[PDB]
Amino acid sequence: FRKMAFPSGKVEGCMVQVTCGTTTLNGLWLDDVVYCPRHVICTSEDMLNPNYEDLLIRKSNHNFLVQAGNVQLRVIGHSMQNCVLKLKVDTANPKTPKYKFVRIQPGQTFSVLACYNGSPSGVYQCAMRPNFTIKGSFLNGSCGSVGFNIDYDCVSFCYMHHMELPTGVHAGTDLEGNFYGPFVDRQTAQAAGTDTTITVNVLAWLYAAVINGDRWFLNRFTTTLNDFNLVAMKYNYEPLTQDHVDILGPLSAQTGIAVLDMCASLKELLQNGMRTILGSALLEDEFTPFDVVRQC
Amino acid sequence: FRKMAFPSGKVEGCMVQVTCGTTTLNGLWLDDVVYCPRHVICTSEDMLNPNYEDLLIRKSNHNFLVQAGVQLRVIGHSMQNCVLKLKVDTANPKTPKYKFVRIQPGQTFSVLACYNGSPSGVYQCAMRPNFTIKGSFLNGSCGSVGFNIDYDCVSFCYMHHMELPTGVHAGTDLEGNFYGPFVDRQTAQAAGTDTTITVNVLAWLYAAVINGDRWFLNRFTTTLNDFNLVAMKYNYEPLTQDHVDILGPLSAQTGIAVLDMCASLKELLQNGMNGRTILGSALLEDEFTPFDVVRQC
Ligand SMILES: *C(=N)Cn1c(N2Cc3ccccc3C2)c(Cc2cc(F)c(F)c(F)c2)c(=O)n(-c2cncc(C)c2)c1=O
Ligand SMILES: *C(=N)Cn1c(N2Cc3ccccc3C2)c(Cc2cc(F)c(F)c(F)c2)c(=O)n(-c2cncc(C)c2)c1=O
């Protein structure tokens, strides 16, 4: 099992650079709007205590340098939605894919196209941690890099990168500018919550093992969902939602192993602790049910 | 600290489907040529024991259906080793600046897995010492390519031909020469004994330090020769002085001498990791090059 990213071409053709004064970052050019972190309107000194509504009333269209490579796109309007700036430009991007904006749930994976100075540099898969951070690989200059899934040539944008936190993990927003997690776009004492294991994905990984004939850990037991959730938390595992149970349905059907039967199996692995699964001693939690199917 | 592939856009616009009869796979369209595995000309029966010069002479241009998202008309064909080259009537307008390179064992590249001419996923792989690669390829992935990108120039280094019985992958360069002792015939084929890419493990241990993980370091040193004795014992590749040189930047950056890191690795091979993990792994990772680490650290 490999972490496979989606082909990045469709997103590559949407990446631009946005500059306010000396502050620069990446933006995303879809039709005639460029989306980017609103913190582009800040000097580094302003970050210590920014008032965005004011910094923005005082900006004008002509203050924003938007560039696709070295070609300037003239801005004809500006607004902010939550923590994202939307710059209306005078050119509709001919390379705009079919797209939507999605707000993903913790556990969901997506591809990150890391970008510097509007120029894509690399692509990799990432999971949204339960504590609403991502364990990304971002260097300074990466703000405005985006995360996405691709579903029949429709690009679902789910993440825009804003910042690195103290412990070296990453935080940002959806494409409506709403942060994942409790973070804010100003310099404070902010820290990631204590993280937990993504139970839904661990179960998907157990289904993957079963599909491949690796099924020693299956037992005769079943559990109630409520009982499972209470025990799981004792081992720093996430409780399951109804949505989780549902996205495990296809793998449940493929293997004929009921979700709550697999939960029983997991509970035992937790209570006794293991002997390998898919030739690994560790339970993997960054492959979703959809990832498992997409690979097998 | 993740495996990071190159952005795949420039390659995506070169992928096409090639079909002969009910045999289909992917092709790479550059200028007015489509490169694909020559085994496209075989039925399953032919593929059991193919005489390719003899099969190819019997084909006409119109036997080849090339599809680019538009049918492209084939106007000429030739074979170069295990790669078929179909000249087509239309030049690919999105051809990047490109080269064909043969990679060295230990080196990494991005794979763009494709099915029916359509890109499906992108990830990094290394060319293993035994000249296989551990890809994520399913049925129909033949003709998917591997590449590196340097300032907009795409260097293609791999074209995918088969999965071996063990679940690893084998293929050719873009000149159609196999990596490893394999052939393009349906017969059971094993690779030689694989070994671990030592220089890469060392690069990855340096990565782990740069990312704030230091539990495996020790105060000890070793000579190159004595390290290599231990490494060969554990089916690791020899570390050369050129490798030590290559590691110079990461050594400079962490203030750990290469031979000091080698002493750490020796202890890891001898003692195991006990309970522990390094950059999330329970296993010593060997598929990041020094260059890959630098490009990210
Ligand atoms: C983003 N492309 C640059 N950057 C920043 N910033 C530098 C800067 C300069 C002027 C004005 C604002 C900024 C932000 C940060 C810092 C940052 C980001 C926020 F959202 C905040 F709310 C904040 F208080 C500070 C940053 O963390 N990174 C970053 C992202 N990912 C990885 C790394 C190593 C660094 C930036 O790139
Ligand atoms: C490739 N897109 C199809 N394929 C093949 N082949 C199926 C087929 C049908 C008719 C004629 C020729 C072929 C080859 C193989 C089999 C194969 C190919 C070789 F070159 C060999 F030397 C060999 F021993 C076997 C194949 O392995 N894969 C493949 C690739 N990667 C992963 C998986 C699961 C399968 C094909 O896709």
Residue numbers in the entry:
A (entry chain B): 3 to 276, 279 to 300
B (entry chain A): 3 to 71, 73 to 300
Give excerpts from the publication.
Because the nitrogen atom on triazinandione could not extend further substituents, we designed compound 2, which converted the triazinandione core to pyrimidine-dione, eliciting comparable enzymatic activity (IC50 = 335 nM). However, introducing a cyanomethyl group, known as a reversible covalent-binding warhead, significantly increased the inhibitory activity of compound 4 by more than 200-fold, reaching an IC50 value of 0.760 nM and a SARS-CoV-2 EC50 value of 4.94 nM. The X-ray crystal structure of compound 4 complexed with 3CLpro indicated that the cyanomethyl group formed a covalent bond with catalytic cysteine, similar to other covalent 3CLpro inhibitors. In the case of the compound 4, H41 was placed in its native state, and the benzyl moiety appeared to be slightly oversized and strained. Therefore, we hypothesized that a smaller benzene moiety in the S2 pocket would be more suitable for this chemical series and lead to improved potency. Compound 4 exhibited very high activity but was metabolically labile (only 1% remained after incubation in human liver microsomes (HLM) for 30 min). Therefore, we decided to further optimize compound 4 as a starting point to find a second-generation 3CLpro inhibitor.
The SARS-CoV-2 3C-like protease (3CLpro), also known as main protease (Mpro) and nonstructural protein 5 (nsp5), is a promising drug target for COVID-19 therapy. 3CLpro is an essential enzyme for viral growth and is responsible for cleaving polypeptides pp1a/pp1ab. − 3CLpro has a characteristic catalytic dyad consisting of C145–H41, where H41 promotes deprotonation of the C145 thiol to generate a highly nucleophilic thiolate that undergoes proteolytic cleavage. Owing to these features, covalent inhibitors targeting C145 have garnered considerable attention in 3CLpro inhibitor research.
